[PDB]
Design a protein around this ligand. Structure first.
Ligand SMILES: COc1cc(-c2cncc(-c3ccc(C4CCN(C)CC4)cc3)c2C)cc(OC)c1OC
Ligand SMILES: COc1cc(-c2cncc(-c3ccc(C4CCN(C)CC4)cc3)c2C)cc(OC)c1OC
Ligand SMILES: COc1cc(-c2cncc(-c3ccc(C4CCN(C)CC4)cc3)c2C)cc(OC)c1OC
Ligand SMILES: COc1cc(-c2cncc(-c3ccc(C4CCN(C)CC4)cc3)c2C)cc(OC)c1OC
Lengths: 286, 292
């Protein structure tokens, strides 16, 4: 009976961090992405694996699962997550060099909204509702067809000493008022972070020969690797929001996207738009 | 060298399938879980993450995998392969002398005490499905405990109890009275250790029946063979254990043999209806270390 070919050739390291490493790998002639977890971040492997063991997500705007592997070593456990490989890399990577036109900007943001609404929605029969809890431009990959997909469900909750990336934390997370037993609270945290990503992308959309340089959200008001307190003072105490440049108000697409961002950034989480309402609004732009 | 050849199916049931396979020139066991038992696969994976679980009397772990394309998911556990099979298989076809009987039961006590005792690491672990089909026989005549899919973990360091999320229940024939009457104290780690001790007592009985004394041995029988239907229901077991207060009978021939007299005493102290009266795994290991 059958050969189970499990060998993956690790070809190129495409990410190194506290989480561990991501490699471009080869399996049976095909590219795969291999995330090798640090000891420090084993709980992210467990949570993503538990989720995929609960529901095998399959969606064009969700990074495609291939496998979770645990391998015993002499004195340690090796944990790999294997997924589809997107050679263009992360949206963060892509926006550094590339500028966008109206069609590519909308395609990027509507594909993200699509992936996020798919996470958020409970389907009966189906999938539980899922909140991501660490949405940001480094956790979004660019596909060759110009749509994106959402990655990293290591913090996801279904209806870990890891917490979300501080720069993208909603005000209720920073002021510890989040209603932690209400699933909808976690959806509203993702909408906040989505609005920051929408801002990051919109800056790189050209209008009337103008574009902004790539900057991360709050680049002008917090340090690199901002503290929790740094973020709380900006977002909660002073209630700052990312700048909308004047030049956007000459462009109908960027004018509509500015309005959309605003409705992701209400202090009151329950006032924020839903991912489904963001999709509809994006489908009516242009 | 990661690839695996599946050579022979050694078992198919509700648990899924187990294959004898070849890996880096060695026999390995490859369990493919039924899609209905996915919570067991995940729990066994959480347990085998613990480097200090490793023990001569615990089934040795190689790898765990979840694989998927489209809507199809496979769940794999890859372990050491024990070609002598389970203790259940072994006892069908062989009788034991004193030395072999004690080697087998002390090895199982050794495994179980290793599970139950926290290492300050490895959490304290209660198995919850101990039975002769979940014990493998090794060529050195010791055994190893398998199938951690129902395990409960506790750390007294942090006062944390992890009962997991598995709808699966233990094998009905081996369920303790408090499991069968559903009065078990579910937020008490000691409750689950006591359930393991009950099932250990039943395994001791199965083994001891196969040890020869004075030219006599009993035929292999599973616990409660005489008092329940074939393929007993939960309620069948509850009737005999809880309502009828039945315990496996001690053959009178055991009482002329010192070893079987000692083992009968040990079984009885695993079988109290009061869970708190039952011996600990460490006490059983110590008692079996002193018996000959
Ligand atoms: C264990 O580990 C890894 C395995 C694999 C892999 C390699 N070839 C074939 C397979 C395969 C898929 C599915 C079936 C089905 C066939 C139909 N039947 C009714 C149910 C079972 C059999 C075999 C797999 C899953 C890849 C891996 O990584 C790329 C693995 O490591 C993570
Ligand atoms: C966020 O999360 C995960 C992401 C990925 C992932 C999937 N496709 C492609 C990539 C990638 C490829 C290539 C570049 C660069 C490298 C330099 N030069 C060649 C330009 C391009 C960057 C990024 C990644 C990092 C996999 C993951 O797990 C397996 C992730 O974790 C869930
Ligand atoms: C993990 O990932 C990959 C796996 C595979 C792969 C390898 N062998 C066998 C299979 C397979 C065959 C048949 C069934 C089904 C068919 C219908 N019914 C009868 C139930 C059983 C399932 C699975 C697969 C899917 C290939 C892949 O890529 C080409 C994979 O992706 C990288
Ligand atoms: C219980 O649990 C697990 C067990 C195993 C495992 C490991 N070595 C050997 C075996 C075995 C081999 C052969 C027979 C023979 C005996 C009699 N003959 C007439 C038919 C068949 C029985 C048993 C098994 C079943 C692997 C597992 O995971 C990979 C298990 O799950 C944790």
């Amino acid at each position: 009976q059958r050969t189970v070919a499990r060998d993956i050739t690790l070809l190129e390291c495409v990410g190194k961090g506290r989480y561990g490493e991501v490699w471009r790998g080869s399996w049976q002639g095909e590219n795969v992405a291999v995330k090798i977890f640090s000891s420090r971040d084993e709980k992210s492997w467990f949570r993503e694996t538990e989720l995929y063991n609960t529901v095998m997500l399959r969606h064009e705007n969700i990074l495609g699962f291939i496998a979770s592997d645990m391998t015993s070593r002499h004195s340690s456990t090796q944990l790999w997550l294997i997924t589809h490989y997107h050679e263009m890399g992360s949206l963060y990577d892509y926006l550094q060099l590339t500028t966008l036109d109206t069609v590519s900007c909308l395609r990027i943001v509507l594909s993200i909204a699509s992936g996020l609404a798919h996470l958020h929605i409970e389907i009966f029969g189906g999938k539980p509702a899922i909140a991501h809890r660490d949405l940001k431009s480094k956790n979004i990959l660019v596909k060759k067809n110009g749509q994106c997909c959402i990655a990293d469900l290591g913090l996801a909750v279904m209806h870990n000493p890891r917490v979300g990336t501080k720069r993208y934390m909603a005000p209720e997370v920073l002021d510890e008022t989040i209603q932690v037993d209400c699933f909808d609270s976690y959806k509203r945290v993702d909408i906040w972070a989505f609005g920051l990503v929408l801002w990051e992308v919109a800056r790189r959309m050209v209008s009337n020969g103008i574009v902004e340089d790539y900057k991360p959200p709050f680049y002008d008001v917090v340090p690199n690797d901002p503290s929790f307190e740094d973020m709380r003072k900006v977002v909660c105490v002073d209630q700052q929001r990312p700048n909308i440049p004047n030049r956007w108000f000459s462009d109908p697409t960027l004018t509509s996207l500015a309005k959309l961002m605003k409705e992701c950034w209400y202090q009151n989480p329950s006032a924020r738009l839903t991912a489904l309402r963001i999709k509809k609004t994006l489908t009516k732009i242009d």
